[PDB]
Amino acid sequence: ETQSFNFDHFEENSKELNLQRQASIKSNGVLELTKLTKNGVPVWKSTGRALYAEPIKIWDSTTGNVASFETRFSFNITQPYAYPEPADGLTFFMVPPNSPQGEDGGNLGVFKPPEGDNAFAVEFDTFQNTWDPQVPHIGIDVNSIVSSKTLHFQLENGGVANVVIKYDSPTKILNVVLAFHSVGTVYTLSNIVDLKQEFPNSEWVNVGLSATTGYQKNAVETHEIISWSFTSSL
Amino acid sequence: ETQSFNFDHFEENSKELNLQRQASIKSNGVLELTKLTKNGVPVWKSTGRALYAEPIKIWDSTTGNVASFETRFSFNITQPYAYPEPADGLTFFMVPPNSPQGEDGGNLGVFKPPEGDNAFAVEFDTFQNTWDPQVPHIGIDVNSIVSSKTLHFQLENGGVANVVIKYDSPTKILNVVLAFHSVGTVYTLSNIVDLKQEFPNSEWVNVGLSATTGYQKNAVETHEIISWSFTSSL
Ligand SMILES: *[C@@H]1O[C@H](CO)[C@@H](O[C@@H]2O[C@H](CO)[C@@H](OC3O[C@H](CO)[C@@H](O)[C@H](O)[C@@H]3O)[C@H](O)[C@H]2NC(C)=O)[C@H](O)[C@H]1NC(C)=O
Ligand SMILES: *[C@@H]1O[C@H](CO)[C@@H](O[C@@H]2O[C@H](CO)[C@@H](O[C@H]3O[C@H](CO)[C@@H](O)[C@H](O)[C@@H]3O)[C@H](O)[C@H]2NC(C)=O)[C@H](O)[C@H]1NC(C)=O
Numbered sequence: 001e002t003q004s005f006n007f008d009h010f011e012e013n014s015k016e017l018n019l020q021r022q023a024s025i026k027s028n029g030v031l032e033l034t035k036l037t038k039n040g041v042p043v044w045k046s047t048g049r050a051l052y053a054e055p056i057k058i059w060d061s062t063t064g065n066v067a068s069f070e071t072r073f074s075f076n077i078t079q080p081y082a083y084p085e086p087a088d089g090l091t092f093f094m095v096p097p098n099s100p101q102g103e104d105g106g107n108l109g110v111f112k113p114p115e116g117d118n119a120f121a122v123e124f125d126t127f128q129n130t131w132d133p134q135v136p137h138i139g140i141d142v143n144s145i146v147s148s149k150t151l152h153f154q155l156e157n158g159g160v161a162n163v164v165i166k167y168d169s170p171t172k173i174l175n176v177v178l179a180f181h182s183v184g185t186v187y188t189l190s191n192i193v194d195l196k197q198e199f200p201n202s203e204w205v206n207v208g209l210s211a212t213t214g215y216q217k218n219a220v221e222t223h224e225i226i227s228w229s230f231t232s233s234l
Numbered sequence: 235e236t237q238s239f240n241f242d243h244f245e246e247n248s249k250e251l252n253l254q255r256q257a258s259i260k261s262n263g264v265l266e267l268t269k270l271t272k273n274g275v276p277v278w279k280s281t282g283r284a285l286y287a288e289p290i291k292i293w294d295s296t297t298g299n300v301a302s303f304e305t306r307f308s309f310n311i312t313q314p315y316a317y318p319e320p321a322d323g324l325t326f327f328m329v330p331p332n333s334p335q336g337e338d339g340g341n342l343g344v345f346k347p348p349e350g351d352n353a354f355a356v357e358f359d360t361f362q363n364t365w366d367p368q369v370p371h372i373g374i375d376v377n378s379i380v381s382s383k384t385l386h387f388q389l390e391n392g393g394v395a396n397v398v399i400k401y402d403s404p405t406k407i408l409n410v411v412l413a414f415h416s417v418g419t420v421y422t423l424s425n426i427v428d429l430k431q432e433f434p435n436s437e438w439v440n441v442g443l444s445a446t447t448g449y450q451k452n453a454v455e456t457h458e459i460i461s462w463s464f465t466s467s468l
């Protein structure tokens with residue numbers, strides 16, 4: 001039937017959120033995906049992911065139907081400095097269960113250089129790689145870091161961002177909306193995605209949030225997740 | 235090539251807006267679509283439309299190419315009372331040039347009960363007719379007051395609303411986003427629309443904003459347009 005988790009805030013232990021690497025839960029009830037310092041000294045090349053414990057049912061083989069989902073979350077990215085040049089970004093992704101971790105930096109901890117695992121991600125790219133358009137930008141990544149579509153947006157440094165991602169099985173429409181209410185700005189980007197086709201060998205996937213800091217000293221930024229709700233309708 | 239008008243504010247006698255009926259420009263620099271008390275005495279069954287002077291090229295018959303466009307505007311709807319109940323709503327529409335007006339009330343001043351002319355509109359329905367779902371709601375009307383898709387939303391009485399309407403020719407995706415920043419709420423609705431087909435006998439259309447008040451007395455609400463920008467890319 002339906003599957004829906006909601007995190008008005010975050011709490012340790014909570015056997016619902018599965019943390020990987022640098023990901024951890026601050027005392028603020030905030031989920032910190034990456035680290036800016038570790039052990040007393042500055043750090044970089046940090047990586048963190050937070051996957052939801054339960055796998056989500058994307059499509060059913062029996063009746064050949066597909067699930068229509070909607071996920072919402074608030075993030076706070078802060079960029080300490082200008083030069084070097086902050087990196088790398090944040091992403092919402094989906095991957096088959098027990099599927100290998102992605103690379104660092106530009107691969108937002110989700111994709112691997114050699115087409116390894118079917119992965120789907122919605123990125124918020126802060127660093128311009130050799131394959132990226134001006135940044136920062138929103139990108140719909142379908143089995144590749146090379147977004148199938150992108151949209152440039154102004155980032156409100158240290159300001160709260162509201163993200164809404166919606167998928168309608170019937171129309172195969174994936175729409176992403178980014179809002180910065182304080183300043184009152186709205187960014188909307190949509191494309192066509194066929195979940196069954198992009199995830200042909202998996203009726204179940206693990207939903208998650210991922211982020212990474214740069215490959216060079218000080219090519220970093222903060223990646224905080226305040227709240228996160230999701231709901232699929234198969 | 236490209237076509238783009240922008241109205242951070244409205245100026246009286248603006249040779250770029252073709253005001254019709256009750257539509258007029260207040261001294262605030264605000265565009266008032268309907269009157270709730272003309273000349274001082276209350277008024278009902280009001281109708282107003284504001285069309286952009288220049289026609290917009292939707293599709294090129296010589297190239298087969300369709301135009302992608304994006305329009306943005308801020309509206310302020312205020313509902314004086316609960317009873318009887320407010321009506322009828324606001325809408326963004328497109329129609330072939332020198333095309334007949336629509337009927338009052340529930341037809342948002344855009345459609346004619348008996349399918350007369352080709353029309354496309356994005357409605358913000360405040361009144362529930364016999365063909366409507368729980369109001370208020372956003373509706374994508376493709377040649378009919380009977381929205382092909384709708385989405386319910388909570389109206390912020392007298393609060394500013396930010397609307398973003400976007401169409402991508404390449405994917406045929408029409409997405410509508412409604413934001414109330416003060417309260418921080420986001421409503422997103424999208425469907426598939428083929429402009430070339432819904433407007434087969436017109437390569438040009440007139441872009442506009444329309445609104446109407448109810449039939450019964452005191453079944454009125456205000457319909458104000460603060461700003462309005464638009465841009466098509468053929
Ligand atoms: C977005 O994320 C950043 C980083 O997580 C949030 O802010 C940081 O704000 C801290 C204040 O709470 C500030 O520092 C500290 O410094 C003060 C004195 O200045 C001490 O009293 C505290 O004990 C603590 O040591 C951090 O320096 C600052 N980080 C950055 C990179 O600027 C910010 O509030 C978040 N935004 C929202 C809306 O939550
Ligand atoms: C959005 O539109 C709202 C409706 O017009 C508007 O509020 C309304 O505010 C006016 C004040 O300008 C109230 O008016 C009356 O008072 C003035 C003097 O203060 C007189 O000149 C008028 O004749 C009248 O007596 C309206 O009553 C009030 N409407 C309601 C339903 O309460 C908002 O302020 C607008 N918001 C923005 C951002 O423009």
Ligand SMILES: CO[C@H]1O[C@H](CO)[C@H](O)[C@H](O)[C@H]1O
Nearest residue numbers: 087088105106214215216219
């Ligand atoms: C020069 O590229 C490398 O470093 C920058 C940081 O400066 C980015 O992190 C990028 O992903 C990584 O491949």
Ligand SMILES: [Ca+2]
Nearest residue numbers: 125127128129
């Ligand atoms: Ca990048």
Ligand SMILES: [Ca+2]
Nearest residue numbers: 359361362363
């Ligand atoms: Ca209606």
Ligand SMILES: [Mn+2]
Nearest residue numbers: 125132139147
């Ligand atoms: Mn990118």
Ligand SMILES: [Mn+2]
Nearest residue numbers: 359366373381
């Ligand atoms: Mn309706």
